[PDB]
Design a protein around this nucleic acid. Sequence first.
RNA 1: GUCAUCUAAUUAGUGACGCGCAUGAAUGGAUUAACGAGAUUCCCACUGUCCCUACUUGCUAUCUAGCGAAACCACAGCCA
RNA 2: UUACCGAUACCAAGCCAUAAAAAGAAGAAAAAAUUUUUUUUUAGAAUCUUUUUAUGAGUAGAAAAUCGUGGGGUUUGUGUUGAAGCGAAAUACGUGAGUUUUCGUGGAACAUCUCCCUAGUGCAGAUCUUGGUGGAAGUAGCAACUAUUCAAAU
RNA 3: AUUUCACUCAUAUUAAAUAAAAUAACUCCAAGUGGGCCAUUUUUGGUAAGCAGAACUGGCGAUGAGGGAUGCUCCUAACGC
RNA 4: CCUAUUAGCUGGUUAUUUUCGAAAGAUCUCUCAGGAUCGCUGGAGUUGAUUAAUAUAAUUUUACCAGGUAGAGAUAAUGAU
RNA 5: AUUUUAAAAUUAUUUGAAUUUUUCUUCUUAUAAUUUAAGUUGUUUCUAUACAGUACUUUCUUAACCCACUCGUCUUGAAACACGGACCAAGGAGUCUAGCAAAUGUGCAAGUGUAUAUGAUUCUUUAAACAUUUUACGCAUAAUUAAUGUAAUAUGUCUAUUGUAGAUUUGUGCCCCACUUUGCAUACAAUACCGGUAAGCAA
RNA 6: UAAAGCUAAAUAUAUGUAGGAGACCGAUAGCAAACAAGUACCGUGAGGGAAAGAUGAAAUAGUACUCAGGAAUGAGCAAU
Lengths: 147, 186, 257, 66, 53, 125
Amino acid sequence: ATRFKKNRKKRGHVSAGHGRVGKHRKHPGGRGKAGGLHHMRINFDKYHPGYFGKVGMRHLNLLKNRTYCPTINVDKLWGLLPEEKKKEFSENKDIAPVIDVTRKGYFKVLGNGKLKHNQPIVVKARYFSSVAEKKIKAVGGQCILVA
Amino acid sequence: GIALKNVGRIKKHGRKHLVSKNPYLRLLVKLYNFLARRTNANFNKIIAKRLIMPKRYRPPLSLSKLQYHMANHPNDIAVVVGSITDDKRLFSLKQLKVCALRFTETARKRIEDAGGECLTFDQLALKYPTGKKCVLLRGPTKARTAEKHFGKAPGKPKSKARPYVRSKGRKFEKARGRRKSRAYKK
Amino acid sequence: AVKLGAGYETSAESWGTGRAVARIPRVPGGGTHRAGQGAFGNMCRGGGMFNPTKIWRRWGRKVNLKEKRYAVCSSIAASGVTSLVLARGHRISHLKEVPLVVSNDIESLSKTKEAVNFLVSLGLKDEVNRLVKSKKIRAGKGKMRNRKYKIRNGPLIIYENDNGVKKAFRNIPGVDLCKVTKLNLLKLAPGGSIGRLCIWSESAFKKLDVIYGKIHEKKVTKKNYILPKSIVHNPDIYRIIHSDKVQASLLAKKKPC
Amino acid sequence: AKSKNHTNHNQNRKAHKNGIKKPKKHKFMSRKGLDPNFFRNQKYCLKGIQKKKKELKLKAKQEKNN
Amino acid sequence: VAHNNVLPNVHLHKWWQRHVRVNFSKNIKKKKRRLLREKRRKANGGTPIEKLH
Amino acid sequence: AVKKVGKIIKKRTKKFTRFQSNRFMRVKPAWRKPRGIDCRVRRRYKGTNLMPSIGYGSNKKTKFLLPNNKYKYVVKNVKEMEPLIMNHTKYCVQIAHNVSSKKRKQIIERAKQMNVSVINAKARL
RNA sequence: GUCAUCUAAUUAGUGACGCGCAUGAAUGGAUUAACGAGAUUCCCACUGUCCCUACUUGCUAUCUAGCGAAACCACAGCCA
RNA sequence: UUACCGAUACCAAGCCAUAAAAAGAAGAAAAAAUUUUUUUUUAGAAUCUUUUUAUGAGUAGAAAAUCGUGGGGUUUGUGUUGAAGCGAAAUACGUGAGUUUUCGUGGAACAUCUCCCUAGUGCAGAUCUUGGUGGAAGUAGCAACUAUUCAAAU
RNA sequence: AUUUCACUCAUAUUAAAUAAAAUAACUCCAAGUGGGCCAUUUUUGGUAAGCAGAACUGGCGAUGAGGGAUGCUCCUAACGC
RNA sequence: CCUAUUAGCUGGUUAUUUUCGAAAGAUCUCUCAGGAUCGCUGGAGUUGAUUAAUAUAAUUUUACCAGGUAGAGAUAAUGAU
RNA sequence: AUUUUAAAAUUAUUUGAAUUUUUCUUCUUAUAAUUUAAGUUGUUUCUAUACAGUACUUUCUUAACCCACUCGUCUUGAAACACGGACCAAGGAGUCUAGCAAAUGUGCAAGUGUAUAUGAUUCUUUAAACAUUUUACGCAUAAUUAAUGUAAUAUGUCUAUUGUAGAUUUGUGCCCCACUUUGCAUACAAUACCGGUAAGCAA
RNA sequence: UAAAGCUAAAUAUAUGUAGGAGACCGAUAGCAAACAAGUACCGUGAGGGAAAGAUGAAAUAGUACUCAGGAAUGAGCAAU
């Protein structure tokens, strides 16, 4: 790795690629994020627009487990289950799959995508989106709330 | 002394050689360079050029987009110089003849189960050396997250670039310059 | 790593405004040669190296498990082809076939004499000679670092059960053993070279299908591992070129300047 | 101390080094802040056109595919 | 800072060279723990070292 | 000045010497490109120490061959001389410096019966 | 500064004068015998300070036997 | 008014490199002797081979390709009939960093360019560090303390 | 205004000319730079200045070669052997 | 000893060839010996072109615009005279 | 080793014609040769009937004609009456770690990385290799809002929003071209839909 | 279920001691110290702090003998 370094290819070039005029000094602009709002303000405003200031109210101790919930959209519910069983449920109209997405690791079912027409499916989840439920019972299925 | 542009030397841009030292891909590049030279086929010229491209210009093409792009002509064969990935959102596949650089295991299994077939580029050169009934396809070369940070700087007016931040809560890059209530907005 | 404070264990003083000497720090005092000499600094005798080597260098590398398994599989495949084993340096002109497998009593044999005799009978006397006369003391000061000799690498005996193989084939210079269930890429591709003479026992050869997915059994098959597929289906690009379908496709040969 | 306050020397040749780049002149321009009550009615026009076309397409497809 | 980078965040403003440590003995300690539990199961001789939870 | 010996053109002799190596002992004559600022040789002032440039390169049809119109190949024992069995007209051999007197004699006799010319044939004898 | 005095000749000294750039009372004012390796002007004596330099003694320098450094040094060393 | 002289510019030609281009994944030629011998060659590496055209300043700065050094794998080697090193060299190669040889000296190790890994890897400068050595130069100088002399012994 | 159908407006020299015009366009990452100075022409302050301040272009800088005896900037002309 | 403190400042910064090749403007800055940012530059890559033509042009032509500098005037106005 | 060919020119015969009317007149008809084509060939000498010289190659040392200021550096500008350098040797300066990104290579892909740890006839090397009883964790797979939270066409259809260009493909005029067919990537726009905010209504 | 108490393991170890290793340094390097090294030497003191390894296989082969020299040395027809 050290023999591929760019400094090696400037070995006899005096300035080491850092300029004969400006030189390579130590912290000529300041240390870290020093000059924001003063002499690095163009950089801060051009690349990190909303950096300065505060917005919103404080949440004192969070406990992310309380509001943790992974989501899944309806268009992946059928792909959750294996191909052969998908074919079985498609060919047979009197049976429907009952999928407990909470077991796969999803807490909320979201409504993005398209479910197969006239293919009933019962979905068990802790939370449901309004459009997710609308699509599920539009294809003849049902949403079951679990906890 | 002569007053020419760039001192009179034509300058090309982009790749000139394969960078990958994968022996199979080197063999494939040799075969398709020969094919492009010896036939007139723009098909082979394009394939020879695309085999050379970096990874970011050989993006994956999902099964759903593959079978959507090949909907109108069903007896042709689709050639992709990237990888073919599975799409769980797709409910059913149908009888696809696809040549590609690589197939994920799920995509390959699904294609053979649907009854189509997966082809390598040497088989494509064997059976359709000119590209008859062969449709050149590619995945989204600009969908990747790196492009989301490119373009106008985040901070220029009406800019859609994603900024570089550690996290994306309310207290990260969201106060001054991103809402009217703190100086200005974007 | 060098000692943490090496070169910097003196009193710092650079009394250097008008002494007509360079402004480098100098050791204090008098009465000895060291007094007034250039102190720590990469340019000074006894001063400390520029970036002292530290023990938190990135010594190791985490390698993707799939990539490691790919490398092992490719090394086995390479060992299976004769031209590669010839090109790596083994003298295999006289053995009958390169994916060379012997009966299971190679595992039961236990004397170095009869191990060398078996190697000779297989047609590897020239390889054994190369191994025994490659022994010689290396150049450089690695030999003042417990690295005296340098040997060539000979056949790798791959067995399934140790009934004497290890303690029969060790002590033959350049010969390495490996249990089939713990195949090591470092042994399979010594130095990164491609295609090592491998002597398989019958059972070790048979266990390869079990290990790599065919005829799965519970505690032997690599779980959920799929053998890497190739970018090309048949790499005989010149045969495909000479095939009549594309020969009819080609345009007439043209002429240069 | 005193310095050169200003100059435009070399600026023109810097400008012409990478040429005087022209605007791209795309075929379509956004109508975002332009003539409301006209472009809204154009949205309605286009919706009517699309629906009239698409219902013919659906009819023809259904009657040719049974 | 310069260019379009994430704003730096490194918490190395104290004497960190004193607090860096590297585990050269991860697998050596693995072997030692394995040997210890092997020996303490041979010592009690048949009765498992595991307790029901 | 160029020298011509048959088809062999050497575009220049008297190899390039480092600037000021004549009048400084610590400056060895091995060529170094003068990086400098007001460097005379770098600026290509007239009448001083011209720099090498690719234009001096010799014709690649005759680029590497010796005054005998043969490419030199250095050998360390008798086994490295096998390829010359069918290159004897365009390659000449040279015995490596650290080869002892027996290997030297053996190499000379094998080269003679291969009729491959030897450059340093009379060394260590 | 002006007027006296001192000299042949006084931007010096001393004595006066005082609308004093900007004197002044324990920020002490004024004056004082005695004292001072303190600052200053003049006089007598004195003299190589000088006119105007010369001669002379010691110790060096100098040459020799012996011993024997250092500073400085890009390369060097004629001018219009 | 003519002639002439006069550039690293211009023109024709050769060669080097850079850029681009046209194109490419298997067969006997000659000569010298005397139907027969003999001498050369008889090609096919794709970042390759053949051919073509234009082009070539360059600080700061950037990149590529090359050249070396310590050590590690792999390969395949040199050493007491003398290794490394060093001194002088060469009808030697390279454009060049260099490489390779010869003679001498030396007396015990040394390469690896097959490919790759690794770094404490390349010096003219830093009033650089340590050590050694110059010109100055047989020069400055060996000047306080009044002063030495004759003869003998060792 | 949009959409769909018609019909058709030079192109065989190209809706004027010329064009080693695609050596283009675009994106990404990043260096150095951010003391300038000079010449011609214009021009402000100043008695003036090898003075200070500006405009255009070309240079020097970063660059040698031939000439101007000499000369960072003038003239010719820019550089592989 | 903390401490190899810090330095927008001075000095130094190590092989070859080859190819490309600047800036000394500008905006903000407790800024004026500094910095960020734009410009100029390299490298990488794609899309194009490869069709003596389109894109294109520090160029002209044709058509059409905008100007109040030089000049001119003082009897056109104003201000001088 | 399948263009040093073909043609062109010339010579010698040959067929016809034309015309400037012929000892270089032109145009082809055929053949045979040549080169002016289709980038230098021949002769004679010498080296020499030698084995390294007084020759030839080469290195070095000396001259001679022309030219040539001291390098490094800051600088608009250095040979500078700007600073550093008496000489030589050896040493001597963009590195290491963390973290982020871009680029490129590699593996796998809606996943990916098996973390700590465990096991296992491996326990010189080995402190590495090998392995992981069918919801550990990171990142990604969904955004948006301070936030309670809410969360991507929408069941008329396994379908996959709409245009304008556009790669590829299909036909008719196996290799040029104008219409046909398909419409990747991408660019420019339009549309829906999700979160927030306004506005209208609001059990 | 505070304002009393004990408690092993998993954890850390720039110290000391003892083992074993290394893509480490190779006498201006590596610890300051490869050696009679925290020694010599310096400072009133707190403290500061070096330089310095290699004959040869064998000195159980370390130069005998002669000549010239006061001797150191030198030379040899002498010698390991």
